[PDB]
Amino acid sequence: TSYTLNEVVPLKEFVPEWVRIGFSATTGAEFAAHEVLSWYFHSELAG
Amino acid sequence: ETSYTLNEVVPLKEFVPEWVRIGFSATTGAEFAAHEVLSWYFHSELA
Amino acid sequence: TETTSFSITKFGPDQQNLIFQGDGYTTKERLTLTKAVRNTVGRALYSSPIHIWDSKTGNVANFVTSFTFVIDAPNSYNVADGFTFFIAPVDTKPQTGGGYLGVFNSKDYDKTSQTVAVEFDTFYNTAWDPSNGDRHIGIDVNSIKSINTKSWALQNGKEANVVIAFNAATNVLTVSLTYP
Amino acid sequence: TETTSFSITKFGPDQQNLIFQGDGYTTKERLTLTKAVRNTVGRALYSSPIHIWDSKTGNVANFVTSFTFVIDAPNSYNVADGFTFFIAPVDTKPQTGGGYLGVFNSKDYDKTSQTVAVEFDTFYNTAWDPSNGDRHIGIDVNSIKSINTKSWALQNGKEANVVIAFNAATNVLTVSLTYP
Ligand SMILES: C[C@@H](O[C@@H]1[C@@H](N)[C@H](O)O[C@H](CO)[C@H]1O)C(=O)O
Ligand SMILES: C[C@@H](O[C@@H]1[C@@H](N)[C@H](O)O[C@H](CO)[C@H]1O)C(=O)O
Ligand SMILES: [Ca+2]
Ligand SMILES: [Ca+2]
Ligand SMILES: [Mn+2]
Ligand SMILES: [Mn+2]
């Protein structure tokens, strides 16, 4: 079962030139364990 | 076409911590020169 | 040209190339962002800054990230709050917990936030979430109110694989979640 | 498996994924470690820690780095001190300048240093350098006196291409420097 979403997000308008990336998870009055098992990242910026 | 190669067995685990930083250093003293790096590529893989 | 890449197949107890915030830590070879415990936030960031665009050239970067994650609730009805992949300023720090997923502080668009997140939202907050109360994937930019959403049915305790890719030429951000 | 990769083909003025120490800074597309000025030390480090071996499984990483660099001196006779690529603890800070190249403090072996370096050394320091007096490439572990060295003729002002590879199955470190 796959779920795909796509949108146009002109990143240069919203974030700084240098950024950090990562994950976030929270609980409130209701809760759940949130875990990441593996992570791969690649970015390339032409110049 | 002019090359210089040096090879050595260096058991890194005996000398360096498990987590390291890598980089460059250069210095001058009573004599001097400009030391500059124009591009850098690095790749490591730990099975 | 600049590229940054990394992969972590299994997480160790001392995973020094990550920055941990709140209660996020690595355990049993997983990155644990929260345990099943009330009112917590956990975040983990890659330690190197990434050069996502350059003001001098105007070039913007492409990127791809894929990760497997799991949400484990007691039952599939009392589960909250969700999880995020986010891109933020170098000095980002946890923002409000609960339904703001540690990443935003208002439903109101805030240009000083400077972060966009892909959320996997498991709890309906009547005030800003999709009106149909479903769990959903959403793209958030400077607000907890998504610019777009897609309903998703949570498979509790199942491993999910996701790919997020940004293509600078067309400015398109694509999110895919699969349960195998 | 854990991988770290990056490339910087052209350094620019706000290179945030580098930690600069001493007088190193980035200028006119270059990383400048030293200008042609007396008594200086400059170092630059990648910002992310890299996992070079693991105590839980005993595995050590394979890695390769390549870079091109330039040494520009007033003339070919009065040139000093050199340049290093080094591997060191996460908290490394500049050590002694001059002939110690910013990475070591002594010619005596010190296991507390935990630094291995490949040096490109342009000035003969009679207390520890090869007595033939030649400029040389060297591999340094925990001391400025190299465990092995190779004579190299400096081409002043010219770009040099370096590849340094480590093969973990044999623990062999290979260095090659090429001029066009
Ligand atoms: C560290 C050692 O370094 C040397 C420096 N002090 C010397 O006088 O100038 C040369 C050329 O720059 C250096 O090799 C010392 O003398 O203190
Ligand atoms: C964001 C909103 O957070 C909600 C929190 N207040 C509530 O207690 O628990 C639910 C479910 O865990 C959260 O979504 C808030 O009050 O800050
Ligand atoms: Ca919610
Ligand atoms: Ca010397
Ligand atoms: Mn939502
Ligand atoms: Mn030497």
Side-chain angles (χ1 to χ4, degrees), chain A residues 14-15 19-27, chain C residues 21-22 33-34 40-45 81-89 91-121 125 128-129 138-146:
Chain A
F14 305 123
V15 306
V19 291
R20 271 218 261 244
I21 47 167
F23 297 106
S24 185
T26 58
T27 58
Chain C
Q21 290 173 342
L33 281 332
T34 62
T40 39
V41 57
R43 314 214 301 174
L45 297 291
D81 265 286
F83 157 82
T84 260
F85 167 78
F86 69 88
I87 294 156
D91 58 358
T92 182
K93 279 158 203 173
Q95 300 310 312
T96 304
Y100 296 96
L101 268 10
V103 71
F104 291 116
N105 288 310
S106 202
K107 48 181 293 180
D108 289 296
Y109 185 91
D110 185 5
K111 64 179 172 187
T112 58
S113 157
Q114 296 176 91
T115 138
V116 329
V118 181
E119 52 166 66
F120 298 86
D121 193 340
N125 290 86
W128 55 72
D129 275 338
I139 294 174
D140 303 340
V141 331
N142 298 144
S143 162
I144 193 65
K145 258 276 281 176
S146 300

Side-chain angles (χ1 to χ4, degrees), chain D residues 44-108:
Chain D
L45 305 167
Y46 180 58
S47 41
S48 179
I50 90 119
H51 210 162
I52 193 90
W53 66 272
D54 171 30
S55 57
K56 284 213 179 171
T57 309
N59 303 316
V60 19
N62 291 291
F63 69 81
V64 51
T65 186
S66 50
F67 43 89
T68 89
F69 69 98
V70 183
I71 286 176
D72 209 349
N75 56 63
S76 297
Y77 283 90
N78 298 285
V79 191
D81 269 286
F83 165 78
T84 271
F85 164 77
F86 67 93
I87 298 174
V90 169
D91 54 15
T92 190
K93 297 158 221 83
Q95 305 299 314
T96 309
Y100 297 99
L101 309 176
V103 284
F104 300 110
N105 295 307
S106 175
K107 55 172 170 57
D108 292 345

Side-chain angles (χ1 to χ4, degrees), chain B:
Chain B
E1 271 69 80
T2 301
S3 295
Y4 299 97
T5 294
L6 174 67
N7 265 96
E8 195 50 89
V9 173
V10 180
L12 254 53
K13 178 183 199 180
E14 306 310 326
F15 302 123
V16 121
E18 298 161 67
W19 282 98
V20 288
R21 273 225 251 252
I22 49 164
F24 298 107
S25 71
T27 53
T28 61
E31 285 185 5
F32 55 85
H35 292 277
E36 310 175 301
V37 168
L38 279 51
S39 45
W40 184 20
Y41 158 76
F42 178 87
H43 181 249
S44 67
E45 190 190 339
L46 176 72

Side-chain angles (χ1 to χ4, degrees), chain D residues 115-127:
Chain D
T115 304
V116 30
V118 176
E119 76 172 43
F120 297 92
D121 187 349
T122 56
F123 183 87
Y124 173 47
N125 287 95
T126 58

Side-chain angles (χ1 to χ4, degrees), chain A residues 3 5 7 9 15 17 19-24 26-28 33-37 39-43 45-47, chain C residues 1-2 5 8 31 33-34 37 40 44 46-47 50 55 59 65 68 70 72 81 84 86 98 101 171 173 175 177:
Chain A
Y3 295 97
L5 170 54
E7 264 278 72
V9 176
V15 306
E17 296 166 82
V19 291
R20 271 218 261 244
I21 47 167
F23 297 106
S24 185
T26 58
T27 58
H34 294 101
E35 306 184 279
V36 180
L37 274 54
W39 187 19
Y40 165 73
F41 175 86
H42 174 77
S43 68
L45 171 67
Chain C
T1 308
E2 288 171 56
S5 319
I8 306 166
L31 167 55
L33 281 332
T34 62
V37 51
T40 39
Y46 186 56
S47 57
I50 280 92
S55 52
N59 287 326
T65 199
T68 300
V70 178
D72 250 288
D81 265 286
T84 260
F86 69 88
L101 268 10
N171 277 147
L173 221 207
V175 190
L177 187 154

